[PDB]
Design a protein around this ligand. Structure first.
Ligand SMILES: OC[C@H]1O[C@H](O[C@H]2O[C@H](CO)[C@@H](O)[C@H](O)[C@H]2O)[C@H](O)[C@@H](O)[C@@H]1O
Ligand SMILES: OC[C@H]1O[C@H](O[C@H]2O[C@H](CO)[C@@H](O)[C@H](O)[C@H]2O)[C@H](O)[C@@H](O)[C@@H]1O
Ligand code: CO
Ligand code: CO
Lengths: 270, 270
């Protein structure tokens, strides 16, 4: 028995329409709980709702199968108009609702899943200003706000700063943590462990991702990652699987079983 | 106790000119044996000699410390005329001497460390014709011939075939195996295990390589690699370390110790 979360994007293909119900997620929640997942990270936020349902209902649904509502992927990248103007006010109204709805759903974290590589350092600084502003609102509501990488964040901006480094260096630790995706880091030619040592404590969650099933490919050194989790600052780990060798359910079950069997994965990080 | 080899390029900084010897390697051979390495892969072949010594003397020196002379990195590239013509006969005289020198040194394998990405599929095919002929000569002398990748072989030729794939497909299994560098495969965005399953039996040796010390970075999934070593065809594993967190001897010892402590690394593959 270990505390391990699942990103619901992983089962996007198993959440469809049934009767009048447009996002019929309850069946897959029960299947995931049955496998042994202990918490979820959502991937469907809009207009104060999750999967088209009230925060309160969604929370009840997740809790009914014995899992925790832990985190969510959502956000609102800046328009070209906002990058040039610096006026985020319309964006910040959206964040007020978003944060309130996440608190209502019982979330401990909110994570933005994607920002594009900016053309200039000036733009990157505007992004840092935005990220700090959002993180500050989150902390006032008692939520931790973070950012999830792909591989493009390991590119340099204007041949100077690496994008992810700049983000980390120019955000306050209480406003922003990094939900490090260890597969995309490797695909970016980055060493997760070298990142952990460079920015101790900033990696409060990990996305445990591989090419397909966790621990199958030979491309990610989970042993070394987990050996360095304390330095990193890990509180929670979330499995993510987007490509599959088997039917989706089996793929995500085998991924969980890799971590459950691994002696280097602790029973809890929180 | 496990059978684990060491690429002597790893300790190039510890083999200097000193005294009577242009390459004073005996002290480091003894340090490597004392650490627990069982075999060596050379990286200094020239005109019938190893590290400036006769094959017979080099072998005596390696065997005196209880290690095996296993493998060697060497190879002669084609001229522009030979590449355009497909006439290797000049190059094949070099190979007769090379093969004989390696057999005298007790070598089981000879591995070519580098070919550049060819401009055309015609050029690549000529290279495959060359690799086949070398490997046939090696085989007739009792030696297994192989090729060691970096990241560039995961590039496409003429936006068609991937270079490493084309090489494997167009060489006979008994003439050529791949000494797969697992770190450079990952840097090339390739899955070692997916390569193993695509080309079963062709990976007779592995280069066990990481960014620095083996198993430190988080960038290589050694557990998955070793779990699939039978499909792959692994017979021997060779450590390589080229960048170091510590003094060279400690870095290569820590690298060995990771493998000795890893339960998924068997005592022998041969
Ligand atoms: O050591 C040579 C490289 O140094 C930098 O890259 C390292 O540090 C970056 C920031 O932490 C990482 O993104 C990267 O993965 C590291 O290798 C430098 O930015 C590179 O240009 C050099 O290759
Ligand atoms: O998944 C589609 C891709 O297929 C090829 O790439 C895969 O196969 C290559 C040959 O074995 C590997 O080098 C590579 O790592 C694999 O991802 C194809 O070359 C790609 O263009 C496709 O996107
Ligand atoms: Co992810
Ligand atoms: Co190598």
């Amino acid at each position: 028995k270990k505390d391990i979360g699942i990103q619901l994007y992983s089962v996007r293909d198993l959440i469809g329409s049934f009767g009048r119900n447009q996002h019929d997620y309850k069946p897959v929640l029960k299947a995931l709980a049955d496998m042994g997942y202990t918490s979820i990270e959502a991937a469907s936020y809009n207009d104060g709702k999750f999967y088209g349902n009230t925060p309160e209902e969604f929370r009840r649904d997740v809790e009914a199968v014995g899992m925790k509502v832990l985190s969510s992927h959502c956000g609102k990248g800046l328009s070209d108009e906002e990058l040039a103007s610096g006026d985020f006010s319309e964006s910040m109204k959206w964040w007020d609702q978003c944060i309130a709805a996440h608190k209502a759903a019982g979330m401990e974290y909110i994570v933005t899943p994607y920002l594009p590589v900016p053309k200039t350092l000036k733009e990157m600084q505007t992004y840092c200003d935005y990220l700090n502003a959002i993180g500050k609102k989150c902390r006032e509501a008692g939520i931790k706000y973070g950012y999830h990488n792909h591989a493009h964040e390991f590119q340099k901006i204007e041949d100077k700063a690496v994008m992810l480094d700049y983000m980390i260096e120019n955000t306050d630790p209480e406003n922003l943590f990094i939900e490090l995706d260890v597969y995309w880091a490797v695909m970016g030619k980055a060493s997760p462990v070298d990142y952990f040592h460079k920015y101790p404590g900033r990696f409060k969650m990990l996305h445990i991702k591989d090419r397909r099933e966790i621990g199958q490919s030979g491309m990610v050194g989970f042993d070394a990652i987990f050996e360095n989790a304390k330095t990193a600052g890990v509180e929670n780990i979330i499995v993510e699987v987007e490509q599959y060798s088997y039917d989706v359910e089996k793929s995500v079950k085998l991924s969980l079983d890799y971590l459950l069997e691994a002696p280097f994965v602790k029973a809890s990080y929180s």
